[PDB]
Amino acid sequence: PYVPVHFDASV
Amino acid sequence: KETAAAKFERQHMDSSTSAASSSNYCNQMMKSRNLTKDRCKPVNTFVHESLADVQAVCSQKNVACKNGQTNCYQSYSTMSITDCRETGSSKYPNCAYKTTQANKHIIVACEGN
């Protein structure tokens, strides 16, 4: 599958 | 070398805590996760949810990334997160951080892996 690679932002 | 996937976990996952304990959580965590080795990483977010819950964000709401890519996903629900921001006075190697705890939605870029 698909995994998180970068944290773009919150809220 | 550390994969992009492996680097994300390293820099943003903290499933052993439901929330930042004290005002020192960021000082503690930036160092231990190794984000203060060549310089002080100016900003960083720690997420306190289980890794399946964060991986799952990749099958949630598709949104555009900041850079315009189209592989960003916003969680449907708010999550426990700790915001770390380098203080005004923070000078390397004495990296200092303001710790902000909150519940919010997160947006992350996803890649195949």
mmCIF file of all heavy atoms in Angstrom, chain A:
data_model
loop_
_atom_site.group_PDB
_atom_site.id
_atom_site.type_symbol
_atom_site.label_atom_id
_atom_site.label_comp_id
_atom_site.label_asym_id
_atom_site.label_seq_id
_atom_site.Cartn_x
_atom_site.Cartn_y
_atom_site.Cartn_z
ATOM 1 N N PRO A 1 0.781 -1.194 0.000
ATOM 2 C CA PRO A 1 0.000 0.000 0.000
ATOM 3 C C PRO A 1 0.833 1.275 0.000
ATOM 4 O O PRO A 1 1.978 1.458 -0.432
ATOM 5 C CB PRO A 1 -0.883 -0.092 1.246
ATOM 6 C CG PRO A 1 -0.186 -1.016 2.192
ATOM 7 C CD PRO A 1 0.714 -1.911 1.307
ATOM 8 N N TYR A 2 0.181 2.266 0.526
ATOM 9 C CA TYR A 2 0.452 3.661 0.719
ATOM 10 C C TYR A 2 0.872 4.078 2.092
ATOM 11 O O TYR A 2 0.091 3.808 3.032
ATOM 12 C CB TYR A 2 -0.994 4.258 0.472
ATOM 13 C CG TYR A 2 -1.062 5.389 -0.477
ATOM 14 C CD1 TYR A 2 -0.249 5.481 -1.626
ATOM 15 C CD2 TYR A 2 -2.006 6.399 -0.229
ATOM 16 C CE1 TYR A 2 -0.384 6.588 -2.471
ATOM 17 C CE2 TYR A 2 -2.152 7.482 -1.068
ATOM 18 C CZ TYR A 2 -1.341 7.577 -2.192
ATOM 19 O OH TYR A 2 -1.535 8.679 -3.000
ATOM 20 N N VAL A 3 2.020 4.723 2.195
ATOM 21 C CA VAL A 3 2.499 5.181 3.532
ATOM 22 C C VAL A 3 2.798 6.704 3.512
ATOM 23 O O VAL A 3 3.113 7.232 2.441
ATOM 24 C CB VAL A 3 3.653 4.329 3.997
ATOM 25 C CG1 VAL A 3 3.059 2.930 4.438
ATOM 26 C CG2 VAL A 3 4.778 4.155 3.042
ATOM 27 N N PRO A 4 2.679 7.278 4.685
ATOM 28 C CA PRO A 4 2.936 8.693 4.940
ATOM 29 C C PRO A 4 4.415 8.941 4.713
ATOM 30 O O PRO A 4 5.245 8.175 5.204
ATOM 31 C CB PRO A 4 2.563 8.925 6.397
ATOM 32 C CG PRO A 4 1.646 7.781 6.724
ATOM 33 C CD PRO A 4 2.265 6.590 5.960
ATOM 34 N N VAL A 5 4.776 9.981 4.038
ATOM 35 C CA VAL A 5 6.231 10.227 3.742
ATOM 36 C C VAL A 5 6.613 11.590 4.158
ATOM 37 O O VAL A 5 7.813 11.800 4.474
ATOM 38 C CB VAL A 5 6.269 9.791 2.262
ATOM 39 C CG1 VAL A 5 6.164 10.886 1.264
ATOM 40 C CG2 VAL A 5 7.274 8.688 2.089
ATOM 41 N N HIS A 6 5.675 12.514 4.179
ATOM 42 C CA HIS A 6 5.939 13.887 4.601
ATOM 43 C C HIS A 6 4.716 14.350 5.378
ATOM 44 O O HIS A 6 3.649 13.925 4.981
ATOM 45 C CB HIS A 6 6.071 14.969 3.489
ATOM 46 C CG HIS A 6 7.049 14.496 2.462
ATOM 47 N ND1 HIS A 6 8.385 14.383 2.698
ATOM 48 C CD2 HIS A 6 6.801 14.081 1.161
ATOM 49 C CE1 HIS A 6 8.970 13.938 1.585
ATOM 50 N NE2 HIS A 6 8.040 13.738 0.663
ATOM 51 N N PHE A 7 4.961 15.193 6.346
ATOM 52 C CA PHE A 7 3.953 15.832 7.192
ATOM 53 C C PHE A 7 3.684 17.195 6.531
ATOM 54 O O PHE A 7 4.558 18.075 6.604
ATOM 55 C CB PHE A 7 4.406 16.010 8.636
ATOM 56 C CG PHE A 7 3.313 16.366 9.587
ATOM 57 C CD1 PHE A 7 2.528 15.342 10.129
ATOM 58 C CD2 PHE A 7 3.037 17.705 9.896
ATOM 59 C CE1 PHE A 7 1.501 15.635 11.008
ATOM 60 C CE2 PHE A 7 1.995 17.999 10.761
ATOM 61 C CZ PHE A 7 1.242 16.973 11.306
ATOM 62 N N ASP A 8 2.517 17.349 5.935
ATOM 63 C CA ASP A 8 2.236 18.631 5.259
ATOM 64 C C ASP A 8 1.758 19.679 6.239
ATOM 65 O O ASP A 8 2.207 20.840 6.097
ATOM 66 C CB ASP A 8 1.321 18.434 4.042
ATOM 67 C CG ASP A 8 1.350 19.666 3.152
ATOM 68 O OD1 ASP A 8 2.495 19.968 2.719
ATOM 69 O OD2 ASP A 8 0.349 20.340 2.876
ATOM 70 N N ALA A 9 0.915 19.391 7.182
ATOM 71 C CA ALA A 9 0.353 20.323 8.130
ATOM 72 C C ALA A 9 -0.706 19.784 9.018
ATOM 73 O O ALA A 9 -1.266 18.657 8.909
ATOM 74 C CB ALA A 9 -0.371 21.430 7.231
ATOM 75 N N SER A 10 -1.102 20.615 9.992
ATOM 76 C CA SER A 10 -2.249 20.179 10.862
ATOM 77 C C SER A 10 -3.324 21.269 10.667
ATOM 78 O O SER A 10 -3.011 22.426 10.405
ATOM 79 C CB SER A 10 -1.893 19.962 12.268
ATOM 80 O OG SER A 10 -1.481 21.141 12.882
ATOM 81 N N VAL A 11 -4.522 20.892 10.876
ATOM 82 C CA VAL A 11 -5.841 21.432 10.857
ATOM 83 C C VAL A 11 -6.202 22.100 9.552
ATOM 84 O O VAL A 11 -7.249 22.789 9.476
ATOM 85 C CB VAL A 11 -6.216 22.118 12.174
ATOM 86 C CG1 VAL A 11 -6.599 23.543 12.146
ATOM 87 C CG2 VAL A 11 -7.366 21.272 12.736
#
